[PDB]
Amino acid sequence: STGSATTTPIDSLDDAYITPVQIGTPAQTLNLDFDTGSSDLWVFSSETTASEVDGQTIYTPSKSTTAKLLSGATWSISYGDGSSSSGDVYTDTVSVGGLTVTGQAVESAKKVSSSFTEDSTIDGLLGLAFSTLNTVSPTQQKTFFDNAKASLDSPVFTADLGYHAPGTYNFGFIDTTAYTGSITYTAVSTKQGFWEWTSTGYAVGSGTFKSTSIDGIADTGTTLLYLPATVVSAYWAQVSGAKSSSSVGGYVFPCSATLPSFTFGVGSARIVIPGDYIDFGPISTGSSSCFGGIQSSAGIGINIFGDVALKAAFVVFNGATTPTLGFASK
């Protein structure tokens, strides 16, 4: 089997991407944030504290003839941005782009933090990291990809995120028309539950490439590119007036700037992030200070190849017995 679904930015900045997902019988379609940095499929639901729902579409398990309470199971998750959610668990039929998993754990939110409530466009998350990170207790549950894998034509999914435009998540096949040149594959460590890999270096603009190992995670659920402070300083030093602002929470730059590109290495191959991808716009409405899309990972504890990086590439998440990651230009 295979599946193919379109993923759409939630706003004009590409702050996140939503992908429609069918849950239950008859189908209830929710727009979920596909997140290769976590491993829970959770949804706003009829059980979510009413004051914490503000515009989201909810899953109502009592209206699904295939929903079953997973007795005694609870979940609770906290994300790198400080947000969180928790609740109980159903199993139900879940389909993405024509690919169907029966008996998928659907984690129903009883509580969500303010950042989730405040974002009316995201109805939940669909985790695509390794199932070892799944938070369901006392019986850990598998991700949608893990459940689908054996049925897929090939045990892979691909992320083709757009810049200020829709893109695609495919399951079970590599669309050879979706990228240019060849796909370069690189080793993955699953030891921390992530799609963790080592970039071979970077360049800023038309500058020379610096060969240096940068361990980090391919994370579709993180907006920005988080890299070591040395790398980030070298980038922003090429933008007149750019500075790290403690009060804003990262590097800002004059909105009048033309940003240089940023290149990262994948083996001997190179992925070029155009300068415009690094612009996250005014820090507050009407400001001439703009927020940068490359930020320091110092104090995160890990480097994160988030959407800013991934959207410059066609990315293969290869879930073969020994997982690997592939990157192509597009």
Q: Which domains does the chain have, with CATH numbers?
A: 5-174 (2.40.70.10), 175-330 (2.40.70.10)
DSSP character at residue 137: B
Q: Is 150 in a helix, a strand, or coil?
A: helix
Question: Which residue in the list 14, 33, 35, 146 is annotated as catalytic?
Answer: 35
> Structure tokens of 279?
């612009």
Tell me which method was used to determine the 3D structure.
Answer: X-ray
Which residue is it, tokens 């963790």?
196
Cα→Cα distances 90→10, 60, 72, 128, 234, Å: 27, 11, 10, 18, 48
ω before 260 within 30° of 0 (cis)?
no
Task: Report the alpha-carbon angle 238-255-7, nearest 5.
Answer: 95
Resolution (A): 1.3
Residue 14 a catalytic site member: no
Pairwise CA distance, residues 276 & 74, whole Å: 42
Give 222-259 as a DSSP string.
Answer: --SEEE-HHHHHHHHTTSTT-EEETTTTEEEEETT--P
Contact 2, 160 (CB under 8 A): no
Of 261, 260, 264, the residue nearest 240 (C-alpha): 260
**Is residue 291 a contact partner of residue 252, using CB atoms and an 8 Å limit?**
yes
Which of 85, 199, 296, 297 is an active site residue? 199
Least Cα distance to 30 among 134, 139, 178, 144 occurs for 144
Say which residues have a Cβ less than 8 Å from residue 177's Cβ, sequence separation at least 6: none
How far apart (Å, rounded) are the C-alpha atoms in residues 258 and 265?
23
Residue 69 amino acid letter: L
Q: How far is CA 220 from the centre of its chain?
A: 2
For residue 82, give Cα distances in angstroms to 77, 86, 113, 235, 248. Answer: 10, 14, 9, 27, 16
CA-CA distance, 215 to 144, in Å (whole number)?
26
296 and 246 in contact (C-beta within 8 Å)?
no
Please say if 39 is a catalytic residue.
Answer: no
Measure the CA dihedral 182/198/291/16, to 10°.
Answer: 60
Phi-psi region of 149 (alpha: psi -120 to 50; beta: other; left: phi over 0): alpha
Q: Are 99 and 1 in contact (CB under 8 A)?
A: yes
- Asked whether the bond before 26 is cis by omega within 30 degrees of 0, the reply is yes
Distances (CA, A) of 199 to 24, 75, 215, 329: 40, 33, 6, 15
What's the rounded Cα separation, in Å, for the pair 175 and 59?
32
Rounded to the nearest 5 percent, the helix, strand and coil shares of the chain are 10, 45, 45
What are 197's strand-pairing partners?
Answer: 216
Tell me which residue of 272, 260, 275 sits closest to 329, measured CA to CA: 272
From edge to edge, which strands make up the β-sheet containing 225-227? 269-273, 262-266, 196-204, 210-218, 303-305, 225-227, 294-296
Check: CB of residue 29 under 8 Å from CB of residue 64.
no
